[PDB]
Design a protein around this ligand. Structure first.
Ligand SMILES: *[C@](O)(CCl)[C@@H](N)Cc1ccccc1
Length: 290
């Protein structure tokens, strides 16, 4: 079982879940995506605890069970500071491994740029160093979908009719192809999705859905800053990932000595599409960089 708490970080109450031991060899901090989702969908990473890896989960500001700060604090930079405050006021000055999924991947990159000295390694899964680039790629994926859904996305999406059933049907299709390739989605994932729709972070920072970014991160791009990361880095991405391997390649290029692994037959939530394989990869990476 894990230890759950609702502690006050640098100003706001953040919910976190720490699953540690037995035979702890390293600590791994995780950053969920969205922005505006929850740690819930990363619970599958809990398996690594049996490999000597302590896993820390937490709901970022305004996410899941955590309280929402002032609107002005809805930025990646604030998220980074929040992450460091949590790491310190919990692990002291210990060097920890950092993993981020999608937006959490971007968030993990921003963190590394400033606090890599507190890290022993970095893991970016379905992450991105450029939203504009990510958008370009997803736009290609849209055009590749069957006209039936592609047209619906361009039609209703252009008129702001996200409530339309045809549009929603097209959105769902895209998800079952580039978000999670499964007909039986795990409760953990559905819960994070529910949290994204219930809170305000996703709507404000991101937009209506995964491929419609009108939020405050639409122009975020730190590709020219990530080459500064010199710590061991593991970059993963799915073959049919909504944040395509081309975006992952861009990250891979900048971080010298970084590793890039493309999961075949998988998309964005590779932690569930290939749980054993995904956990094994990260576990080996972590254990080989102690
Ligand atoms: C990940 O957070 C989802 Cl788990 C993803 N929404 C990040 C993202 C994708 C495309 C454009 C902006 C952000």
């Amino acid at each position: 079982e894990c230890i759950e708490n609702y502690a006050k970080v640098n100003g706001i109450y953040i919910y976190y879940k720490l699953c540690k031991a037995p035979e702890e060899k390293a600590k791994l901090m995780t950053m969920h995506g969205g922005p505006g989702m929850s740690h819930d969908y990363l619970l599958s990473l809990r398996d690594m605890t049996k490999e000597g890896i302590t896993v820390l989960f937490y709901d970022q500001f305004g996410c899941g069970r955590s309280e929402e700060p002032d609107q002005s604090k809805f930025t990646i930079d604030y998220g980074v500071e929040e992450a460091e405050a949590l790491r310190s006021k919990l692990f002291g000055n210990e060097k920890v491994f950092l993993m981020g999924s999608s937006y959490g991947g971007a968030l993990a990159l921003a963190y590394a740029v400033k606090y890599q000295d507190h890290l022993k390694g970095l893991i970016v899964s379905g992450g991105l160093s450029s939203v504009p680039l990510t958008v370009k790629e997803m736009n290609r994926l849209i055009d590749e979908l069957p006209a039936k859904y592609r047209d619906a996305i361009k039609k209703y999406g252009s008129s702001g009719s996200y409530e339309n059933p045809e549009y929603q049907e097209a959105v769902n299709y895209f998800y079952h192809q580039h978000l999670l390739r499964s007909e039986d989605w795990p409760p953990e994932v559905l819960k994070s999705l529910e949290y994204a729709e219930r809170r305000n972070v996703f709507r404000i920072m991101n937009g209506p859905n995964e491929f419609t970014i009108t939020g405050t991160i639409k122009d975020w791009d730190i590709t020219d800053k990530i080459s500064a990361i010199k710590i061991p880095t593991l970059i993963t991405v799915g073959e049919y990932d909504e944040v395509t391997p081309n975006v992952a390649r861009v990250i891979h290029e900048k971080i010298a000595g970084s590793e890039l692994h493309v999961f075949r037959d998988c998309s964005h939530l590779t932690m569930w599409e290939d749980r054993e394989g995904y956990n094994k990869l990260l576990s080996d990476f972590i254990l080989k960089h102690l």
